[PDB]
Design a binder for this molecule. Structure first.
Ligand code: ZN
Ligand code: ZN
Ligand code: ZN
Ligand code: ZN
Length: 267
């Protein structure tokens, strides 16, 4: 059983732009990459195997992907499934090069597939947002409504390190009625909320509001984009998975994760 243990990862990035409370105006773009990881020692392995067993895999739910770019050195020579035969001499050349360059490395990550995920508006979005501003001549009311949305992801999984940053115009003298607690950057004139986790297991099922009032010393505030951050582990957005075909290899791990890229909301 000289089967090389190997690892795979899908990593997805969701971009979203929300416009007031109007779902039809939400612009969504999801991208991703599939990466193969080879464990230190592969070089010795290929030293014993000049003509190794072919590395062939199949990507599940392939129809959910569009704009697929296969590694032009390692790949490319029907509905929902696509099979690949990795180019072995080029993979070994590669792995020899990076190994003789980072000999201390515990694994070598190789990019196989770059792709886009067919998205359908606000449904494809793991965190729904609606922002409302009330801009008085000397006062500003800010409301951020968020909703954890399981429909965007393959399996119900938490959002981690969630950040809500928003610039406040008009020269703020004082913060009032701030709920939950946030952090005011004075030098930068902008407010930041942090929630460590959001999910079904969160309070109110992952549905919440961020509230702030601001006293101004200069005119009204002009609303600015809410910028959001979060990461996630244990699920993809695309619903893709990977399988080995043929003998000689084993997946030691298949890591699935996604993260917010440009994730904005306007008034
Ligand atoms: Zn071996
Ligand atoms: Zn096929
Ligand atoms: Zn290379
Ligand atoms: Zn990469």
């Amino acid at each position: 059983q000289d089967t090389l243990p190997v690892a795979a990862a899908f990593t997805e990035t969701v971009n979203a732009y929300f416009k007031g409370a109007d779902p039809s105006k939400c612009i969504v773009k999801i991208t991703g990459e599939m990466v193969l990881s080879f464990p230190a020692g592969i070089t010795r392995h290929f030293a014993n195997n000049p003509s190794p067993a072919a590395l062939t895999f199949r990507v599940i739910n392939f129809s959910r992907l569009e704009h697929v770019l296969p590694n032009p050195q390692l790949l490319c020579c029907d509905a929902n499934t696509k099979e690949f035969w990795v180019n072995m001499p080029n993979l070994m050349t590669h792995l020899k090069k990076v190994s003789e360059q980072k000999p201390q490395a515990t694994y070598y990550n190789v990019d196989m597939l770059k792709y886009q995920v067919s998205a359908q508006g606000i449904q494809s979005t793991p965190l729904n947002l609606a922002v409302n501003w009330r801009c008085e001549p000397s006062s500003t009311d800010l409301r951020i409504d968020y909703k954890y949305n399981t429909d965007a992801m393959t399996t119900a999984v938490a959002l981690n390190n969630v950040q809500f940053l928003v610039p406040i115009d008009g020269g703020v003298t004082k913060l009032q009625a701030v709920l939950p607690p946030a952090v005011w950057n004075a030098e930068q004139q902008r407010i930041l909320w942090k929630i460590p986790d959001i999910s079904q297991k969160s309070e109110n099922g992952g549905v919440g509001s961020l509230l702030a009032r601001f006293q101004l010393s200069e005119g009204p505030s002009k609303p600015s984009p809410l910028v959001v951050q979060f990461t996630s582990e244990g699920s993809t957005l695309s619903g893709c998975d990977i399988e080995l075909v043929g003998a000689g290899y084993r997946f030691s791990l298949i890591k699935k994760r996604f993260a917010a890229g440009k994730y904005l909301a306007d008034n």
